[PDB]
Scaffold this active site. Structure first.
Site: not given
Ligand SMILES: *[C@@](C)(CO)[C@](*)(O)[C@H](CC(C)C)NC(=O)[C@H](Cc1ccccc1)NC(=O)[C@H](CC(C)C)NC(=O)[C@H](CCc1ccccc1)NC(=O)CN1CCOCC1
Ligand SMILES: *[C@@](C)(CO)[C@](*)(O)[C@H](CC(C)C)NC(=O)[C@H](Cc1ccccc1)NC(=O)[C@H](CC(C)C)NC(=O)[C@H](CCc1ccccc1)NC(=O)CN1CCOCC1
Ligand SMILES: *[C@@](C)(CO)[C@](*)(O)[C@H](CC(C)C)NC(=O)[C@H](Cc1ccccc1)NC(=O)[C@H](CC(C)C)NC(=O)[C@H](CCc1ccccc1)NC(=O)CN1CCOCC1
Ligand SMILES: [Cl-]
Ligand SMILES: [Cl-]
Ligand SMILES: [Mg+2]
Ligand SMILES: [Mg+2]
Ligand SMILES: [Mg+2]
Ligand SMILES: [Mg+2]
Lengths: 218, 222, 195, 233, 204, 196, 222, 196, 195
Positions: D1-2, D107, G1, H91
């Site tokens: 997820t980015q 993902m 998301q 992240d």
């Protein structure tokens, strides 16, 4: 995606073995995807399984079950019990519990040591032995006809009609049940197929001959 | 929807496609998105279909009463002002996106109105889901001092860009020309480049195909 | 939340309603009458949200009784059912709607015919030979669809009903403590004490 | 997820009779801030392919490194690396498309939209698109982002179907691309005036044009526009 | 909890040569449970016909409302309301409840008594008018009806032929929808006679 | 948006870009954000296009009614009417307005009205999304009592930078000059200001 | 998301005859309201007289087809160039789909060809691997529009013999390749009219004992 | 934070404020945000204090190990190591770093590494929350091949404005000069830079 | 879900377990035995999440039977209960815990004493004279608290139990279709067929 579809499946024990009866409709929401779905899975010549919940989950794992049953009899030189066959399936889905499998099936068979036997197997791990089982969106409608008319000493002819009439009752009332009725008779020497019956034609035929469904103009 | 407006020498022209959707389904293949507010003030509408028709009819009614009260031909700025104040009051909940155009004693005018009540002025405008496709054409081919015939061509070409490239737009091209000193000419189905081809087969059934349970004569008379 | 059933036969309308009143994990009462007499030949059973049910039923009862006194005349079951529907139709778009489902069993004295109306909380009215509310229909309709004939007697109707209650007592998860049965016919309303 | 940080906007392209054209502006946006102005988003691979990339710039620089390493790897134990066994546009595209789909399936996508433009060894024009989802498609005209909404309509007026490709010259095709880049500058809030353009021709080969500017703009009519309705002054 | 698909049902209307047809199924349910097979969704006020799909309580309420309004119209105007005028009345009445709408999909059908022209129209739940030369569809099987009508329909059909086309469009659409079916009714409307036919269909 | 208003020797000058956006799409590239509420009282609009238009229309109505009864209103009075609307409807508005006007007594005045509805009288003011990038530049380069030409250059260079860095700003640079002489409109195109 | 799925639109159609089978699909590829391509094929010859289409999310569709084509290749290597029967291919595809039961291919798969008796065969799959043999199957965006028409014209549903009081059904019979293509073309032109994601072009793959033939037809581009 | 690095004739100069915040509380008013990863390769740190320290410590380790094996690393090499860490751990990191170094061959070089982990080689770079307010000022005032004294004034005036407008910036202005001559540290206090 | 009760008297342990198996709005079975014999003088009843209950009970059964064969010796009820507790104590911190509550009734042959253990799904063990799981305790404990004496006979224990089932059948909302009763004593395990 949509795996939560409607159905009416039943199976009951009686003097002459087991009757299995199912509807044929598959729905994706309000959209009727199919009217010709095979909801009885022929595991092998002696064992049957019913489809309710996930179509893929039932197809895939009850075909897989037939492979395990064939390996059992090759190694043990003996027919697999319904108890053992049902437990192979229930133990398998129990491993997958929480992942999201969707299954509600009756594993049906007739052996020497057991006699006619039915096991309700379910995706949250439940495994129940019983005489009468009904599963699906239209199970309540079918139970009503079954309970009021069921006897152990039913003939094979009358038992086949009862299973057919019970599915018809659900097909009529439950929107997500219908299409056609598939019948099966399970004996000790194997199962026997008793044809496909279109509900459209079957309804009008039963209405006239039986005198039921007076609420419906025909 | 795709809708456009283009100013020219002695007036203004507006245009629109004729598709009406309901999700991914085409509900009306030939709906009219060009509305008359007054004889020489017309309105192209995008967005919520009921809202564009309702708001344009209400303001049109009040414009008529105003014209009778003042003994004057109605002005575009009056329709603009009445529309924007109505839309602003409802805080965007009335989903009407309009291109208002017309001629009046003051001259020729072209405006756009958005659902929340903001207005804009311009020589060329476009609204609706296919506005980007239409605006691309307008930005490529528009120039100052357009003639009547050039403006109609440019406006319809802009609608065509929406018809072909935007899935929200399709079917035909409606046009309305408002020139100074002349009656406004509403050109319904000015272009029809999406005619359905002949079907391969006739599906006319033999009589008696359908099974029937009951017949009865219905009484419509008193 | 419960079992209200209705069966229209040749010469009468039969209503059956569960006796249990449950709140949490306790059955507070097992002899509750979930019905009100609207007029001498009209009976209404009800089920739904607690409090709303009785408040609504009594409000309707009062309005119909008021009409009877004013006109010195009994409203037809059709007229009463339409009035009830409209009140629920108003209710559903109110600040706090009545969450009440009803069956209206009546005998029309002018037509000499029994009539059964099913009305849900949205104001959805249907005239039926037999009816139910909640999950009750999911069990009994297949039975009624099969065994129900339009020319049945009151006694035949009571036997058909027993068959329905038996199926409910067998397959339903909750204990509803049996049913109170009432009959509506040309002679008015009476209760079956032994069921 | 980015989530994408530093981004590049539209990439536009089309086929013409003898080859393909591709273009993209030189901007690296940081949200609404027009932070970086010397960003090259067209990356040549050999003398027969150009990869145009939009979306996340950090992920674009990663893809640059992969393509650069691909050329090196292809030259290993390959005497015909500058001839029959040189890298083709179809080879380069399929590699990227494989990577993009693998990354979406883990993902953890490369937040990009990519157009691979080039000419094959047999002279055939190659033009194909791939994005963060691994979705691929080909068309006589292709564009990303706002370009899809505004450029494609203009480029499809020139080449509306396959049969229009032989009828379209490099002069006409380049003119349409340059016009499209002006329209994007008018109407895209995350675009710049400066851009790069590349032509891959089957005869004249790869022509890479840097430091181009949008010109011949129409702004004069703005002086006549006053207020938002009633205002006269 | 989607008001327009709780009760189920469909309505379709078509034009022919000097005639119109309007048809509907008879089902009324509560989601999966079928409740009634006699729930007619077509009503008429004089010679103007109105079909209504969607939430059943609103179907009933609107019929009672348009009966109310057309009865007063006739008393004051001293004549029966025409389809074009009635269409506008329906539109006005629905838009009056713009921010608390009736969850319905009404369909108007009829022949103008003065001009003799066949007329049909459709609406969304807030009153947007959808006028059409060919056909109008409404209900939970609207997608299915659009597909049948778009392929089966042809212009200037005679009443007897038009009957078969609209009947087949409705029946086959209803069988691919769970919430529609359980019977069907077709109105064939000529200038000064109206025939109503109940169709035989599968009851599942 | 990028907007500003600057007082100088002879009066005050309002400045603005011409961009209107819907997300990243430019809905209007030739917008007029400088709007008249009275002969020599103007405002710069930033924030919601609908809200700022509705507000300016109401203020223009109030000042027209003020003039009919009490004669020409002050720039402070105009700013007070703006404030009253912005403050009392703060929950439902998104409007950043700069009010600028020329009196003969008070000369050039500038009032800024941020989101909350507060009022701030200043020598010069900047506002809008693009103003963030020129706080440093404007603070270093602003001087009091500048000439007309100096003030025009100051605004031009300032909005040039704001446009360069802000994606939400662009198009042409509009300006309105308010002095005793009258009202003068100015416009500056990309080819000029971009290469400053 | 991050959302790993998308909708590329399009619709497909598989019909089975006596000694043949067809698998049709429109050539339009879309995202939201934009057209990505007017000609992007999604019906493929996979060898062994098997044609295949996986409609929905194009990335998953291309991946599946690519894996099946590869499955056919290895079946030849491992089993002495044996021909993969349509029923065997179907079961194999189930295992491909169900292999990702907990992160599914977002596609509706249809394959067509001839069974081992030489008769026309069509198989259809849900996204997670449940499959069924059928005479007739539409898939994708406009499936709901096309399918009830097929029920009526292929399987003759709701059609009774004229004059028989709705007692005698219209008899089932195999259609010719010419009649089937007529139904396919009319199915797609009707879907094109009423569904915004359907149009541009129609590509049909016909399968007989002789091999795999192709036919292409233009559709409306709006 | 407000940070910047500027190349000039003789090399490169790094500049930074000294403020560290926890919400609105200043946890450290004399922070050193200019940190050495090699003799003449330094970096400016913005974002998370923990993340930027952890990263700089790892880079210093990598460059020390590089030097033991392959001799002095390039400024480009140092920026690549920073990038690798920032990109591959995007992240879990909040770090805006400017890398600056002096080679004898390449002279002064500046690389900036934003949040995503992209690398951008520039003549000068600005970063941190306070940089937003000086994009206009820095763009107008920067010239290539400036002298040491000119470059010091440019950075001083720029960070002075950034500090003035940004609440998250303040304290002293630290600077580090990188040339062939060596490494010089500079500091400038509020009383000086505030009244510029 | 449901009703498992336990009573330890002078010379035996009595376990009562409901027969109903419900899924949704349908009672699928009304003759289900919710117990497993772990050893000749040890019995375990269970209630909780579907599937988990039987899977856990049979897993325990297998482990205890394995022990019996290996050592040619029967484990004491205390030892078995401790083993069961530990397995549940492990389970509660697993990726997916067993949501199963159990009662373990056994007769210790070395001590010549009956023993009743109550263990919830968390692994919370208690030895009790009488025990229950779920809502069952909320009804019966006050009755047992009153009428229970430590020197009762097996017959007196069965009467006390009947009294509990009667109170449950009266006040509980759900129909649990009666109970299967089993006795554990010096002579082993046996079932009461008429209850
Ligand atoms: C292009 C074609 C699309 O953008 C144009 O903009 C046209 C404008 C013309 C027609 C004036 N827009 C539409 O066609 C518009 C698109 C749309 C849809 C939904 C919301 C906003 C815009 N379509 C409509 O307005 C249709 C008109 C029908 C086809 C007659 N209406 C609907 O789709 C309604 C929406 C009603 C609505 C209520 C409250 C707020 C906003 C809109 N939706 C339905 O009828 C769906 N549903 C059917 C089952 O019954 C319950 C409702
Ligand atoms: C610069 C751009 C920012 O400082 C200027 O301030 C200008 C001021 C000028 C126009 C006077 N501001 C805008 O251009 C303004 C930006 C904006 C957007 C949303 C809220 C506040 C400010 N743009 C608008 O107001 C447009 C004008 C239209 C295109 C004519 N309106 C919208 O963007 C509407 C506003 C709805 C709204 C939201 C919140 C508060 C008030 C109103 N928004 C949309 O249409 C949403 N859009 C739908 C399609 O999906 C993308 C989002
Ligand atoms: C300027 C201030 C902004 O650009 C500079 O960038 C400096 C950089 C210097 C220090 C190298 N940045 C900070 O001072 C930085 C601001 C910040 C805060 C949070 C996330 C990113 C940046 N401050 C910090 O890192 C402080 C340093 C402490 C006080 C020594 N740390 C915190 O504020 C921690 C960080 C926790 C964290 C959050 C998100 C990502 C990474 C780490 N936050 C708290 O302690 C929360 N605090 C608890 C009490 O309630 C109020 C909030
Ligand atoms: Cl504006
Ligand atoms: Cl620090
Ligand atoms: Mg059904
Ligand atoms: Mg149906
Ligand atoms: Mg800009
Ligand atoms: Mg189309």
């Amino acid at each position: 995606i949509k795996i939560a579809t409607g159905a009416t499946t039943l199976a009951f024990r009686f003097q002459g073995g087991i009757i299995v009866a199912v509807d044929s409709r598959a729905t994706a929401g309000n959209w009727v995807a199919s009217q010709t779905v095979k909801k009885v899975i022929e595991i092998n010549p002696f064992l049957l399984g019913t489809m309710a919940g996930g179509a893929a989950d039932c197809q895939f794992w009850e075909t897989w079950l037939g492979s395990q049953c064939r390996l059992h009899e090759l190694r043990e030189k003996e027919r697999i019990s319904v108890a053992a066959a049902s437990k192979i399936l229930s133990n398998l889905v129990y491993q997958y519990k929480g992942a999201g499998l969707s299954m509600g099936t009756m594993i049906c068979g007739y052996t020497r040591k057991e006699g006619p036997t039915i096991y309700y197997v379910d995706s949250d791990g439940t495994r129940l032995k019983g005489d009468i089982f009904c599963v699906g969106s239209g199970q309540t409608f079918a139970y009503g006809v079954l309970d009021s008319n069921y006897k152990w000493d039913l003939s094979v002819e009358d038992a086949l009609y009862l299973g057919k009439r019970s599915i018809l009752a659900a097909a009529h009332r439950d929107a997500y049940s219908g299409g056609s009725v598939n019948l099966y008779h399970v004996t000790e020497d194997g199962w026997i197929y008793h044809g496909n019956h279109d509900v459209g034609e079957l309804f009008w035929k039963v209405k006239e001959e039986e005198g039921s469904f007076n609420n419906v103009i025909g | 929807t795709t809708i456009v407006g283009v100013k020219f020498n002695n007036g203004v022209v507006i245009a629109a496609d004729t598709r009406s959707t309901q999700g991914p389904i085409v509900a009306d293949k030939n709906c009219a998105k060009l509305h008359r507010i007054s004889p020489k003030i017309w309105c192209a509408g995008a967005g919520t279909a009921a809202d564009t028709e309702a708001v344009t009819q209400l303001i049109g009614s009040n414009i008529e009463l105003h014209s009778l009260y003042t003994s004057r031909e109605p002005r575009v700025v009056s329709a603009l002002q009445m529309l924007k104040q109505h839309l602003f009051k409802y805080q965007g909940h009335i989903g009407a996106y309009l291109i208002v155009a017309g001629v009046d004693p003051t001259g020729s005018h072209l405006f756009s109105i958005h659902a929340h009540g903001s207005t804009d002025v311009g020589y060329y405008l476009s609204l609706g889901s296919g506005s980007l496709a239409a605006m691309a054409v307008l930005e490529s081919h528009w120039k100052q001092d357009l003639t009547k015939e050039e403006a109609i061509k440019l406006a319809s070409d802009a609608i065509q860009a929406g018809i072909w490239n935007d899935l929200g737009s399709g079917s035909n091209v409606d046009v309305c020309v408002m020139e100074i000193g002349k009656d406004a000419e509403y050109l319904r189905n000015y272009l029809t480049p999406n005619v359905r081809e002949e079907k391969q087969k006739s599906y006319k059934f033999p009589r008696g195909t359908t099974a029937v349970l009951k017949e009865s004569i219905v009484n419509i008379c008193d | 939340m419960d079992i209200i059933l209705g069966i229209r036969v040749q010469d009468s309308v039969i209503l059956a309603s569960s006796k249990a009143v449950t709140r949490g994990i306790s059955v507070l009462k097992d002899s509750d009458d979930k019905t009100r007499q609207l007029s001498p030949h009209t009976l209404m059973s009800f089920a739904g949200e607690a409090g709303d049910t009785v408040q609504f039923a009594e409000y309707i009862q009062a309005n119909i009784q008021l009409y009877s006194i004013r006109e010195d005349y009994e409203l037809s079951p059709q007229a009463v059912s339409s009035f009830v529907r409209q009140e629920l139709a108003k209710s559903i778009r109110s600040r706090r709607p009545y969450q009440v489902n009803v069956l209206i069993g009546g005998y029309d004295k002018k037509k000499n015919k029994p009539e059964l109306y099913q009305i849900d909380y949205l104001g959805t009215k249907v005239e039926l030979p037999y009816g139910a509310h909640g999950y009750s229909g999911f069990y009994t309709f297949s039975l009624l669809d099969h065994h129900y004939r339009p020319d049945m007697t009151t006694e035949e109707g009571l036997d058909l009903l027993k068959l329905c209650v038996q199926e409910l007592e067998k397959r339903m998860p909750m204990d509803f403590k049996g049913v109170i049965v009432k009959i509506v016919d040309k002679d008015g309303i009476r209760q079956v004490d032994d069921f | 997820t980015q989530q994408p940080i530093v981004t590049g906007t539209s990439v536009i392209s089309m086929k013409y009779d003898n080859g393909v054209i591709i273009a993209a502006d030189n901007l690296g946006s940081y949200g609404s801030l027009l932070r970086f102005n010397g960003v090259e988003r067209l990356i040549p691979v050999g003398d027969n392919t150009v990869v145009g990339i939009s979306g996340d710039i950090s992920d674009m620089q990663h893809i640059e490194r992969l393509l650069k390493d691909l050329v090196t790897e292809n030259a290993y134990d390959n005497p015909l690396a500058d001839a029959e066994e040189a890298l083709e546009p179809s080879y380069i595209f399929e590699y990227l498309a494989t990577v993009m789909y693998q990354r979406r399936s883990k993902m953890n996508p490369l937040w990009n939209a990519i157009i691979v433009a080039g000419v094959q060894s047999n002279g055939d024009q190659f033009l194909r698109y791939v994005n963060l989802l691994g979705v691929t498609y080909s068309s006589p005209t292709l564009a990303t982002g706002f370009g899809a909404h505004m450029a494609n309509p203009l480029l499809r007026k020139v080449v509306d179907r396959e049969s229009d490709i032989p009828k379209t010259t490099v002069q006409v095709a380049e003119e349409a691309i340059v016009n499209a880049m002006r329209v994007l500058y008018y109407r895209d809030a995350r675009s710049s005036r400066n851009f790069s353009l590349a032509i891959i021709d089957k005869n004249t080969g790869l022509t890479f044009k840097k430091n181009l500017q949008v010109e011949n703009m129409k702004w004069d009519f703005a002086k006549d526009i006053k207020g938002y309705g009633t205002q006269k002054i | 909890s989607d008001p327009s698909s709780i009760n189920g049902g469909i309505v379709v209307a078509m034009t022919g040569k000097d005639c119109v047809a309007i048809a509907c199924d008879l089902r009324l349910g509560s989601q999966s449970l079928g409740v009634s097979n006699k729930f007619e969704k077509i009503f008429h006020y004089g010679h103007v016909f109105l079909g209504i799909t969607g939430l059943a309580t609103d179907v009933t309420t609107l019929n009672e409302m348009f009966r109310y309004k057309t009865n007063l119209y006739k008393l004051k105007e001293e004549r029966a309301i025409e389809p074009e005028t009635f269409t506008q009345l329906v539109s006005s009445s629905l838009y009056e409840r713009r921010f608390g709408p009736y969850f319905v999909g009404p369909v108007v059908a009829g022949i103008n008594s003065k001009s003799g022209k066949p007329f049909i129209a459709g609406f969304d739940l807030i009153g947007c008018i959808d006028e059409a030369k060919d056909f109008i569809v409404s209900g939970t099987a609207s997608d299915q009806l659009f597909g049948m009508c778009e392929s089966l329909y042809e212009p200037n059909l005679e009443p007897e032929d038009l009957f078969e086309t609209i009947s087949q469009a409705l029946l086959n659409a209803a069988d691919r929808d769970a919430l529609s079916g359980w019977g069907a009714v077709v109105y064939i409307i000529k200038k000064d006679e109206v025939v109503k036919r109940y169709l035989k269909m599968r009851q599942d | 948006t990028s907007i500003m208003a600057v007082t100088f020797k002879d009066g005050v000058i309002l400045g603005a870009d011409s961009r209107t956006t819907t997300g990243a799409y430019i809905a209007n590239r030739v917008t007029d954000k400088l709007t008249r509420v009275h002969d020599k009282i103007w405002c710069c609009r930033s924030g919601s296009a609908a809200d700022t238009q509705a507000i300016a229309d109401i203020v223009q109505y109030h000042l027209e009614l003020y003039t009919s009864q009490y004669g020409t209103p002050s720039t402070e009075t105009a700013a007070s009417v703006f404030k009253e609307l912005c403050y009392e409807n703060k929950d439902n508005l998104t409007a950043g307005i700069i009010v600028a006007g020329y009196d003969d007594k008070n000369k050039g005045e500038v009032y800024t009205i941020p989101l909350g509805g507060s009022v701030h009288k200043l020598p010069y003011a900047i506002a809008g999304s693009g103003s963030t990038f020129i706080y440093g530049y404007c603070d270093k380069n602003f001087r009091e009592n500048m000439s007309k030409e100096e003030t025009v250059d100051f605004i031009k260079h300032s909005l040039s930078q704001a446009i360069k860095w802000d994606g939400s700003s662009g198009g042409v640079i509009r300006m309105v000059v308010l002095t005793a002489a009258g009202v003068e409109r100015l416009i500056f195109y990309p080819d000029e200001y971009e290469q400053l | 998301q991050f959302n790993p799925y998308g909708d590329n639109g399009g619709t497909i159609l598989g019909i089975a005859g006596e000694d043949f089978a067809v698998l049709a699909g429109d050539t339009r590829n879309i995202t939201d309201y934009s057209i990505n391509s007017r000609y992007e094929p999604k019906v493929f010859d996979c060898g062994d007289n098997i044609v295949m289409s996986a409609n929905g999310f194009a990335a998953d569709g291309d991946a599946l087809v690519k894996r099946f084509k590869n499955s056919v290749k290895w079946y030849h290597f491992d089993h002495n160039d044996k021909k993969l029967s349509i029923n065997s291919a179907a079961r194999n595809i189930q295992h491909l789909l169900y292999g990702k039961r907990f992160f599914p291919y977002y596609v509706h798969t249809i394959i067509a060809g001839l069974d081992e008796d030489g008769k026309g065969a069509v198989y259809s799959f849900d996204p997670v691997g449940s499959y069924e043999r059928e005479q007739c199957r539409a898939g994708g965006a406009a499936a709901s529009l096309i399918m009830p028409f097929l029920d009526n014209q292929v399987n003759f549903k709701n059609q009774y013999e004229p004059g028989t009081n709705g007692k005698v059904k219209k008899p089932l019979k195999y259609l010719s390749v010419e009649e089937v293509i007529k139904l396919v073309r009319d199915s797609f032109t009707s879907a094109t009219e009423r569904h915004i994601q359907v149009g541009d072009g129609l590509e049909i793959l016909i399968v007989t004992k002789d091999g795999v033939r192709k036919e292409f037809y233009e559709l409306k581009r709006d």
